[PDB]
Structures are given as C-alpha cells and as structure tokens.
C-alpha cells in the first residue's frame, strides 16, 4: 500500500524527486500540505514546515485565506557539517519525566 511516497520539489535553481518514509508523509499530512505548497524538509531530523502556497498559484482565487510565497531562489538541496552541543543535564531532564509527547 505505502512503502514510501514519492514527492517532487522545485526551486528557481532546479528540481528533485525524493522518496519519503511514510512517517515523513504522515508529517506532510500533519501540516495539511498539498501540491503547489512551498515546503522545508529537514531530512536528517524529519522536521517539516509549510512556508506558504507557491505564488504561481496566487491567482487560483482572487481572495482566499492562504499566504503566498515566491518560489524559493535557493538551491533545492543544501548540505552542511553541523556540530551539536548537548549537556548531560539535558539528557537527565529530557529522559526522566514522561515527555509531553
């Protein structure tokens, strides 16, 4: 039924297709995302955010309750080395009580 979801992405620098884990697609549906939305995916963490509807669809109705954003001028895909600092106290706190979840 759902091994994965293919998703297609576009920016002013080009396009990619990605093969999403069903847990990430469950997050796309959490954010109420549909084709023609502008999305940020953080593939190392599974964070997903709707930035807004893409402004190529800004004339789909004359007045509708969505905010439209310009097609991103940035790359479709970006990499960095990042270095995370976490204290033993952050572990002692975040694992002791049941999380908010």
């Amino acid at each position: 039924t759902i091994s994965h979801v293919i998703i297609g992405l576009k920016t002013a620098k080009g396009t990619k297709q990605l093969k999403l884990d069903p847990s990430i697609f469950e997050s796309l549906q959490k954010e109420r995302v549909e084709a023609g939305d502008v999305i940020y995916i953080e593939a190392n963490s599974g964070a997903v955010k709707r930035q807004g509807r893409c402004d190529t669809y800004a004339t789909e109705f004359d007045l509708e309750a969505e905010e439209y954003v310009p097609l991103p001028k940035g790359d479709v895909h970006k990499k960095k080395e990042i270095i995370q600092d976490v204290t033993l106290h952050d572990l002692d706190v975040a694992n002791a009580r049941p999380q908010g979840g």
Partner: protein, 152 residues
C-alpha cells in the same frame, strides 16, 4: 520582563465596506468591497467562504480581513446602511494595504511562551514557576544571533 525584543513584520491586510456577498452549495462565491476612493469584486476561496459565513458578515458592515489568516474583524456598519449599535465611515486609500507592524515582546515573555504546551496562559495566570535554566541558556543565545543577523 524589563529587557524588550522588538521586530517588524509586513502583512497583506484588506479593509473596506462590504457592498455585497454571495455563496453557493465544494463551494464557490463572490464578494465586493468599497473604500471612499475605490471598489472591487472578488472570487472567494473555500477557507474564506467558511470564515465570512461563520462570522455572519452582512452587506453594509465595515470589515478588516487578515488575508494571511482568514480572520475577520468587523468595525461597525456604514452610516448610509445604519437604518433597520455602532456606525462608521468607509476606509480611505486602496483596499489591500501591505501594512508594516512593529511589535515587542519582553525577553521573559519569550521564556513563558517556550515553557508549556501553551505558554501564554502561564504568562497571565501566574503558573510560570522555576522556569528551566537550560531554556534561558538557549533563548538568550538565540536572541543574541537575531540581534546581529539584524532580524531583531
């Protein structure tokens, strides 16, 4: 409480007298708005249709529409439709203004927003207590980069 963060944000705000509003049974519908200096008609989308109908917006109201959010604020009725309370004149200038709002949040008021599944209740109700010092260690450092990236 006594050190402020200040930011500015730009919003597409629509303001005017509603001249006429129409709806159908998905859905489609049509709206008209007026200022002292222009008029328009508009095709509405579904999330607006549900908002206008939920909030009983009626021809002759003077209204502000938060275009980013679908929220409606009604200011009163036009004096020419005050017959059959609060009454007010139409806005001046164009309907859709890209208004700039400057806003300020006390540095502590960012801590309380961060503390709970809804933070801001604890701001008023006084449930803010022993706020975890590692959260302040992050927020002070986050505001210290907004200060220099120039976004705040």
């Amino acid at each position: 409480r006594s050190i402020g963060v200040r930011i500015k944000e730009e919003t597409e705000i629509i303001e005017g007298e509603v001249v006429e509003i129409q709806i159908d049974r998905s859905k489609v519908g049509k709206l008209t708005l007026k200022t002292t200096e222009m008029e328009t008609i508009y095709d509405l989308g579904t999330k607006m249709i549900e908002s206008l109908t939920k909030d009983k917006v009626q021809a002759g109201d003077v209204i502000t529409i938060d275009k980013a959010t679908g929220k409606i604020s009604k200011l009163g009725r036009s004096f020419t439709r005050a017959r059959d309370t609060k009454f007010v004149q139409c806005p001046d200038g164009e309907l859709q203004k890209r208004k700039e709002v400057v806003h300020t949040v006390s540095l502590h008021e960012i801590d309380v927003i961060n503390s709970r599944t809804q933070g801001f209740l604890a701001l008023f109700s006084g449930d803010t207590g022993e706020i975890k010092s590692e959260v302040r260690e992050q927020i002070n450092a986050k505001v210290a980069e907004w200060r220099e990236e120039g976004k705040a």
